[PDB]
Amino acid sequence: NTVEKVLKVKEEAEKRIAEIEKLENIEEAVLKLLELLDEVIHEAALLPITPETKLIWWEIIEAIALAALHKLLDGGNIEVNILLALRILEKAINFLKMVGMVGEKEFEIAVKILEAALHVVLTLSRLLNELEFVKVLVEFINLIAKFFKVLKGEPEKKKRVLLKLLEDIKKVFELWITRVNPEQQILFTELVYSAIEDLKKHTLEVLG
Amino acid sequence: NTVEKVLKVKEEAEKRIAEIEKLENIEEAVLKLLELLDEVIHEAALLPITPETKLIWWEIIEAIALAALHKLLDGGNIEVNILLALRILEKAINFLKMVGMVGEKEFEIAVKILEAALHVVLTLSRLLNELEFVKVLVEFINLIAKFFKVLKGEPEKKKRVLLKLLEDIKKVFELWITRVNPEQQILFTELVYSAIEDLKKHTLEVLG
Amino acid sequence: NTVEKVLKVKEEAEKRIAEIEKLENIEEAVLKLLELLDEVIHEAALLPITPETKLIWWEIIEAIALAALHKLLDGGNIEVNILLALRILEKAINFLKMVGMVGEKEFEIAVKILEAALHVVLTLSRLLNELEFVKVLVEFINLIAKFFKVLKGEPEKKKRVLLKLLEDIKKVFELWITRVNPEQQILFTELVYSAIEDLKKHTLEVLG
Amino acid sequence: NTVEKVLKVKEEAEKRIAEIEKLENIEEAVLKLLELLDEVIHEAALLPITPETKLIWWEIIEAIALAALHKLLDGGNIEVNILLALRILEKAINFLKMVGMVGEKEFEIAVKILEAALHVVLTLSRLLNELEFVKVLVEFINLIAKFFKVLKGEPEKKKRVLLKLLEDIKKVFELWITRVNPEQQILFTELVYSAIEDLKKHTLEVLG
Amino acid sequence: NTVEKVLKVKEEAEKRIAEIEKLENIEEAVLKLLELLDEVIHEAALLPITPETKLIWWEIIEAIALAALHKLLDGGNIEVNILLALRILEKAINFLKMVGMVGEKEFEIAVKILEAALHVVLTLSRLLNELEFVKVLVEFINLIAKFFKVLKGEPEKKKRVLLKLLEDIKKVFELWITRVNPEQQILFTELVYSAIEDLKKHTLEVLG
Ligand SMILES: [Zn+2]
Ligand SMILES: [Zn+2]
């Protein structure tokens, strides 16, 4: 049966997650987690999707992704780690496209993954240069736009989630901007606020 | 009749624009929009131009170009996006050459395209390095000189448009220069101001 | 009986695979595996195909091909190894042609062989020059088009497999393109995206 | 017998240490000490480890490491010296991995090396910029996590050592933070306290 | 007697080594040393091997190989020198094959030759381009796999030697990777780490 295959995949994935967790070397652990995500998504693509297996696939993806993000917080190069976080998010979005329609549980899981990735990215970007920080900010805003355009749901819930993410981003940016001299302050504030407003317009038209 | 052909081209172009707008991947969307612009210009070159069809052709070009520029604001690599904006402007200038004489409506449309490209370029160049920023500035000033050399119109209107563009450039540059140490400040100020003065001279002699 | 002959061939092939695995020199090992594959295909052509023997033939082909691909990862010249991987894929496609109609198990085996070849090719192509890398990419996209044109199955499964392969290719290409200067970036991006869209068109029309 | 070989190695290492101490140029001395450490570790890996030779190997490694760290305090480029301290610590951790089980004396020696490296790193990082200082802090916290993950011992002793190291780090950080403006203060305090809490969690789970 | 012949070979080999050492031109000296190695191996193949003569043959091979490697460090073309180091290693491996069973002294000599070749290769590859450096790394990892597959010994000693070699390679690679932009960083890290994991799997299966 298909469900039996999915739970076998889940068991093997948890075993591999424990094995990687016992690897004592963070740089070679995140790559193994990414390869595990790739294998899981390949297996998911092999078999046809059904409502009962969607939740199990989402739990597998959520476990692997959260483990990988926390490992990204545990040492390495900052820019490489930010790139890896964005790539994990992109793989999640591709799986979202493949799985099609989602329910409330899948919506919650996807929002959890997005929120964890956002927190990791903000924590890591606190240590970048000015141009790199603002570039990472703009890139993540565009990624949020893509994620909300692919993911479907009731407009009110998506609006609330978007507001929460924007408040997180704004808090970090308003703390960070005080170090960049009053003219670069104006430049970066205009750029970031325009990006946020364009994001709001895009997702609000998506809601309609 | 030529007019029905041009309106059919317009209908097809709007249909393709909607299709591209629903493509969820920005990097593949700008390239498709540029390809659509190329096909539209090839069709325009195929049939001979008349006063009635000029306006319709300009609306098609305006729609495609504005969509492409806004998509350029929506994610990608900064330098590639700036190059693509300059490419869209150059295609518009080549179409202006092909058309020949331009009236008031066509002048207004072309000025709008130029202003949109300038705003996109400034917004994106805010995130570049020093040398790359100044190189982009000089390149866009030269592009403005070429655009005003090709385009014909009343000297006072062109003077007002040129002054507005120069004020935009000067505002962005005067905000940006405060971050580059007082000697590089003198170097870049000399270079940029000389470029602007040469642009003024060239366009004022173009007025004739 | 025919089935007895097929299992005799299978046993001989496994014995030869073990012998080659104990050969300690990779360049001679891949060629010996290719010769074994040729012998197996000749034997398959000699006997008439039946539904029960199709699975056994596919298992033999799968074992030999996966062993040869993993050996291709284990040392040699990069370009020769890429060519050998493509040759193994082409031999599998020719066997697919000779066999004809396939079930779900044969579909899974063929997709697994294709994915193993794709991963080997991407890994080996990371070390090529710009032009060679893009040439290998385009050649493999055309090979994927041929493979999907020859292989028959339900449109949804083929669409999912194609999407997964395209995501893999886009992953590697988007990591690689950041080293080739913002103008070659535009050139290669246009070329590769046009190739991918043409592949999508061909495959989707094949599905219908 | 292995033992007399190990004391030969010890005699040669001490002779080379004296020779390097008489070299009057600090940049060439740290590199020579690192080469000597590499040679000693190669010799150690050559022969199989025994309980009696473990102590002698640890005394040799402790002598070389302490000499190299003190030489790192005696002049050079700050960032290169911090990097070299981290690499000495990483070599000690790799030797910990190779040896395996560690007794009380080896535990004391390893903690001595770790504490010396920490004090050197804090002293040198006192002269860095804000971003570089906080990056070095986070890197060393992750290195402490790796060191405690590899090294085994009674939970209470490891807890006490961890508390001592954290008090050292916190004292230096609380002195340093008063110079970075009240908003960057909040940013860096959040980041550093989160890193310390993660370190505590990881180590305490390792103890269990 | 055979032993007398072997010591005659040794005496003339040392005489030739001194003559070559007095040659003042390194390019002609490495080729002469390689020719001397070829002559020695031909002589060794001429007479049948015995337990007593194996050690003497290994001392001759070790002397010639170490002299040739150090000369490779003393000037020439970087790529040609790396190739020549690999050829010296391959000749040593072929001699290992022809000799057969290996004791502890021969194991020690072979490991020393391998380590000398590895250090020469790392030192010379420090000055290559990105693609050439990674290609040399992958080639040497495959050569290490071949060497450990041909050479026989107790699993623990081979495991320790392999771990030391991997730490050497990782040290050089982690110093080098910081210059290649964060996306090529991910690409090369995935490639190299996968190669190292495959090497570990291969030799650990060989140990069993
Ligand atoms: Zn952690
Ligand atoms: Zn939040």
Ligand SMILES: [Zn+2]
């Ligand atoms: Zn937008």
Ligand SMILES: [Zn+2]
């Ligand atoms: Zn304006």
Ligand SMILES: [Zn+2]
């Ligand atoms: Zn292998």
Ligand SMILES: [Zn+2]
């Ligand atoms: Zn894949």
Ligand SMILES: [Zn+2]
């Ligand atoms: Zn001192």
Ligand SMILES: [Zn+2]
């Ligand atoms: Zn202390």
Ligand SMILES: [Zn+2]
């Ligand atoms: Zn020399």
Ligand SMILES: [Zn+2]
């Ligand atoms: Zn070494």
